Design a protein around this ligand. Structure first.
Ligand SMILES: *[C@@H]1O[C@H](CO)[C@@H](O)[C@H](O)[C@H]1NC(C)=O
Ligand SMILES: *[C@@H]1O[C@H](CO)[C@@H](O)[C@H](O)[C@H]1NC(C)=O
Ligand SMILES: *[C@@H]1O[C@H](CO)[C@@H](O)[C@H](O)[C@H]1NC(C)=O
Ligand SMILES: *[C@@H]1O[C@H](CO)[C@@H](O)[C@H](O)[C@H]1NC(C)=O
Ligand SMILES: *[C@@H]1O[C@H](CO)[C@@H](O)[C@H](O)[C@H]1NC(C)=O
Ligand SMILES: *[C@@H]1O[C@H](CO)[C@@H](O)[C@H](O)[C@H]1NC(C)=O
Ligand SMILES: *[C@@H]1O[C@H](CO)[C@@H](O)[C@H](O)[C@H]1NC(C)=O
Ligand SMILES: *[C@@H]1O[C@H](CO)[C@@H](O)[C@H](O)[C@H]1NC(C)=O
Ligand SMILES: *[C@@H]1O[C@H](CO)[C@@H](O)[C@H](O)[C@H]1NC(C)=O
Lengths: 168, 314, 314, 168, 314, 168
């Protein structure tokens, strides 16, 4: 686990219906909230990969070894049942472990993608802002909405906005 | 600027390596619980035996008259089926059944046995057709007269085919030593059978069995697979049911047992007695004895696979 | 300000996906090695057969006299047990044993056979009671006089019960054709047996077997399960041991084989020959043939599960 | 692995017996060392979850298929043994893998919780301190012990302590 | 200052929990596909039976003459092998084969049977040596004269050894009741066999079988394991082949079936019909019926294990 | 996943043949590129650990249960085949899962070691440099090649180089 989702971020946005990860800011011009494709997509394209790997086609045919209309002889009947019950124990075991293991990874994967989104925006604003500590960033140069848009699509000049926030 | 993640009011609880009931945004089922109560047989040469028993297709009681030379990708045994008109049964019946299920059907062929001064049209009211008949692929060999005697015979057949031949003969066990002699004459009767592979021999055993189909006599059915260019010989002297035709397996098939209807409207490859399991899920909790190409049976009813992140509502 | 983590001087080595002997703060065992050398049978209707053999409970040699109609949740076979007084044995003995282990005990019932002018009190010094007796649930049918002859008989019984009946008869094989005739008269003796299900027949085979219990004769024990409303018939003429009572299974139970004592002070659900495995661990390295509700047997003696972090001492 | 425990942190405190993760500082007032509940607890409540998931009750009874007093016929005897040995191979395999896989995760989980503790204190002192690089923090405003206590219970004003450490 | 990681132009695609064909720097194979087409038998006492059949080592037809008392760590059955000179076969042949494969070889021992006024040098042109012989470890017991009669005999042997004895006898089935009497005289012939463990009996069954080795007679071979200090008895009167020597198992071995050559130049512990699987890989896709100490068979041809990081070329 | 390899780092150095992780800088004195032992080694000593754990010797012998020259009886023959096919399904399943699971971990392990290397150099230069955001670091005091060498072997005085880069 990476510490973002259900970590220092208190919760999520039940109004964010555009993606998994997004930006909700607060500058003078009013209000806005958007979604990030590439983060959302990289989580989508990975959970989707897990599913496509678990839905398969065992070209492995199995035939009747037993008879329900005419019970086979007891000794062989009991060996078969004993054997079938043994294989069932394995598959029930495998299935439960597989799902638990996968779910753990799926969840820590979504955390990862958040923390990866965060700690990249943080690096995009080399010092023109600082970390509040709840997933929010305080700029010290009043960013506009062609500036917030400039961040979201990764352009923001990492220098040409400096002292205006540095000196302050 | 601030960043967070999506969420929902209503989440779905999953299990993890560490937790048990963590809510995620979205999960999906991993265990199939859905059954379709028909035999989805779309695209397959299917044979529903109904009242014919799979083993009867070899010997030929009247139920099996239309199944003596069938061809199949999928074979269905029914509960109402019967391998028998005249009461009796097969030795190693299930082994034989398993062979027949994946035979792809059967081709019949004259073994070409000829008989020298005995009777040959043995019959009964248990095998009803026009009147009192017998098994279509067999011959009830009798002493020539209504008591008479049986001349220790010898008949043999060679598999001059490229495939193994299914050979089937019967031993008759009468109500008594009385009837055993009226039919075959007196003396302990002995039948021997061999090949470049096989080794056995048989004696009858008259006596009163309870009445089945209205009869107290029985017929022991026995069988052996002859190899290409191997020969099989029948040293016999009575209490004997002769194979008229031999059987060859057509190719490959699947055999199941069911009590539900057939549907050529749905495609299935995983079958059980109650219908078809159509799923792409890796597992299933419907029938542990499901056959064909199936998801693995598991004891669990449900195992939810996370397809999303933690759902943390406000 | 500075932050670190806890540690200890003495850590516990574990294995990982990548390492082998990494020390953690605390680990816990995952494989059960602890056995309790008693049959923990607290709360269960238990039956220790001691010298009675499980199959003897059906036929009734003297060891089994107090086990003819038992009732159980748990059945214990002992090494000193014996299914037999008069030397002999069962055909498909283990199949029958497996049936009896999970029967939940047995209820006995008169089959109600009556005999017409023969002997009926066959006995021996092998089955000792007051004097020379026989199997309690069986009848040693004899030719009426000290040589005499045996009238080819017929007896039949119908399972008018809702549950399948366990039917058991015996075939006697004497020291010689001499003794075979003194007991049953001359001629090849034949016994046939059938149902709406079953098909078999039997001939004796006198001769000298080595001496067991002081006897050179044997008794072949055979058995069949009759269905509700199905009938079973015995065409016989000698060398025959008649079933007096039939058997019905009470419900469900567990059967084990052990040489250790019983303790109603401990509760167990996983048993082996050397005692009870009481554990909640997912695995065990005690007995691969442990039965009941058990952890899975593994070849490994120990598998330590990490319950803490890396132990990094200074 | 996250890099904290047995990473840049040289080792652990065999005297820390109050928890798994804690604070040991150095200001003028003498000395003190404490433990953090919530970090320690979140690691405890997770390892504890693993154990409760591995101790179970297979309501799956298995019956005798063999006989030790009276050996069953050889052919069937050998099929049974062969089959039982095959199932043993699987369970021995499953058990070894399960334990290795779990131990790996358990250990990287404890690392995670440390790094998550660290990189949250680091965010609580937005600039009133800097990272030495060995898990220790240098404040530039002489924090007191109702101030160190203020950090430990997450209160520390992320501003009202500033310039006193900023200017320096 | 800047930091990155290594890479390559040509990477290796692997599969992951989430992806399928991600290129890594370096991967390694996990499934063995490499076979060595020889029996790597370096360091092992090996016995290649060639034309001798494993069961023939007990009875001793001429092919097995040099295998009557062999000793082995590794036993190889060949396709050209044969358990038989005079046509016939064993009852429970494969059980017996499995016992012999892990016997570690066999030690032979005189059972010490002596015969009173009968013939004893029964032979045939099927077992050719100097002239017309028989099985080396057996005795073809005959009625004294060229028709004559057979005196119902009794012979017995006691395992005065610490190990179980393999006992083997044969029942002869002739071309007819004609030849059956010339050899043994008339009347239904009966052989009985018992121990403190065993219970069976036998009757011949003359008749015409097809001609194998130039003969239409057969020999039924039967067998039982006698215990230390247990006794075995043969009540017999004809149609009988007598055991001369009994057999004891030497220790432990492995048995395989192959059609490839032996090499004492290579070491192997995992064998199949086409050679030796020498690998340290956890899995293999060569033969599912591979035996010895082998990697697990898997259906997959290849499973590449990542031994490096993501390969991201510029 | 940690976000370094195939994350903000666009790609890798097909010329870096000295190790897995290394330094390539840019100061006045010309050019140089080196490899880091300890990072590279800790990834090597861990993948190597995985392999040594997957190559084993099951001292578990299995014997013939079947016959190829003389086919055993059909019923028992079919039970054996049915059973063998069932065990094959398990091992094929286990093998595919094991390899996928391991490969996932192997790859996220290499990421981890990079991010661990990075975020330690970053801590070694307490403020005498700042993060560009593509895995590269901008010093503000023109580091020399006995200074770059000083970083690579972890010595760099975290103070005695300060203001020369701080003031700038
Ligand atoms: C085997 O299991 C089936 C159900 O799966 C059961 O109906 C049957 O009675 C069992 N066979 C024997 C021999 O007990
Ligand atoms: C829920 O999960 C399934 C995964 O199979 C997916 O098809 C469905 O769209 C998901 N719903 C949403 C909106 O997340
Ligand atoms: C099978 O039949 C052909 C045609 O008669 C014959 O040439 C061939 O030799 C036979 N196969 C054997 C067993 O030799
Ligand atoms: C060691 O591990 C076991 C886990 O079952 C736990 O009960 C015990 O308290 C642990 N000891 C300590 C103090 O960590
Ligand atoms: C079983 O017994 C009852 C009572 O005699 C009878 O009515 C019923 O028909 C029987 N079952 C069968 C096989 O029909
Ligand atoms: C099967 O295994 C047991 C021990 O688990 C052994 O004692 C027995 O001899 C084996 N059975 C056969 C038929 O070899
Ligand atoms: C590729 O992988 C194998 C792992 O067994 C290793 O022996 C080989 O040296 C590797 N090649 C390189 C140079 O990475
Ligand atoms: C086996 O042989 C020895 C030597 O004759 C004998 O003392 C011992 O009692 C025998 N074992 C049995 C079954 O008692
Ligand atoms: C069992 O499988 C083998 C191949 O693995 C096959 O050749 C054989 O015919 C099968 N046995 C039966 C009884 O069908």
């Amino acid at each position: 686990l990476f510490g973002a989702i259900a970590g220092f971020i208190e919760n999520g946005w039940e109004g964010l219906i555009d993606g998994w990860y997004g930006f909700r800011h607060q500058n003078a011009q009013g209000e806005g909230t958007a979604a990030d494709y590439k983060s959302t997509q990289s989580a989508i394209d990975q959970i989707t990969g897990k599913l496509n790997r678990l839905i398969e086609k065992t070209n492995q045919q199995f035939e009747l070894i037993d008879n329900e209309f005419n019970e086979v002889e007891k000794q062989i009947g009991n060996v078969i049942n004993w054997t079938r019950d043994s294989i069932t124990e394995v598959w029930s075991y495998n299935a439960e472990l597989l799902v638990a293991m996968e779910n753990q990874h799926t969840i820590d994967l979504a955390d990862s993608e958040m923390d990866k989104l965060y700690e990249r925006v943080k690096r995009q604003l080399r010092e023109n802002a600082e970390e509040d500590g709840t997933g929010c960033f305080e700029i010290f140069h009043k960013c506009d909405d062609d500036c917030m848009a400039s961040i979201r699509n990764n352009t923001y000049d990492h220098s040409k906005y400096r002292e205006e926030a540095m000196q302050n | 600027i601030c960043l967070g993640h999506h969420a929902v009011s209503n989440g779905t609880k999953v299990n993890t390596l560490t937790e048990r009931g963590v809510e995620v945004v979205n999960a999906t089922e991993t265990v199939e619980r859905t059954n379709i109560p028909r035999i989805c047989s779309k695209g397959k040469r299917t044979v529903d035996l109904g009242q014919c028993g799979l083993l009867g297709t070899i010997t030929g009681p009247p139920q099996c008259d239309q199944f003596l030379e069938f061809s199949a990708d999928l074979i269905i045994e029914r509960r109402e089926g019967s391998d028998v008109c005249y009461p009796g049964k097969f030795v190693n019946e299930e082994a034989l059944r398993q062979i027949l299920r994946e035979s792809g059907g059967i081709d019949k062929e004259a073994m070409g046995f000829t008989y020298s001064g005995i009777r040959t049209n043995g019959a009964t009211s248990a095998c009803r057709r026009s009147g009192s008949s017998f098994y279509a692929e067999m011959k009830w060999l009798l002493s020539n007269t209504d008591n008479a005697a049986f001349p220790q015979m010898t008949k043999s057949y060679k598999n001059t085919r490229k495939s193994p031949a299914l050979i089937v003969w019967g031993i008759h066990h009468s109500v008594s030593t009385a009837e055993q002699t009226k039919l075959y004459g007196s003396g302990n009767k002995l039948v021997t059978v061999g090949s470049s592979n096989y080794q056995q021999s048989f004696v009858p055993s008259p006596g009163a069995r309870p009445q089945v189909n209205g009869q107290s006599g029985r017929i022991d059915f026995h069988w052996l697979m002859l190899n290409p260019n191997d020969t099989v010989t029948f040293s016999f002297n009575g209490a004997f049911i002769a194979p008229d035709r031999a059987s060859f397996l057509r190719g490959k098939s699947m055999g199941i047992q069911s009590g539900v209807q057939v549907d050529a409207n749905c495609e299935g490859d995983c079958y059980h007695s109650g219908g078809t399991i159509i799923s792409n899920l890796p597992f299933q909790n419907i029938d542990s004895r499901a056959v064909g190409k199936c998801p693995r049976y598991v004891k669990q009813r449900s195992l939810l696979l996370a397809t999303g992140m933690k759902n943390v509502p406000e």
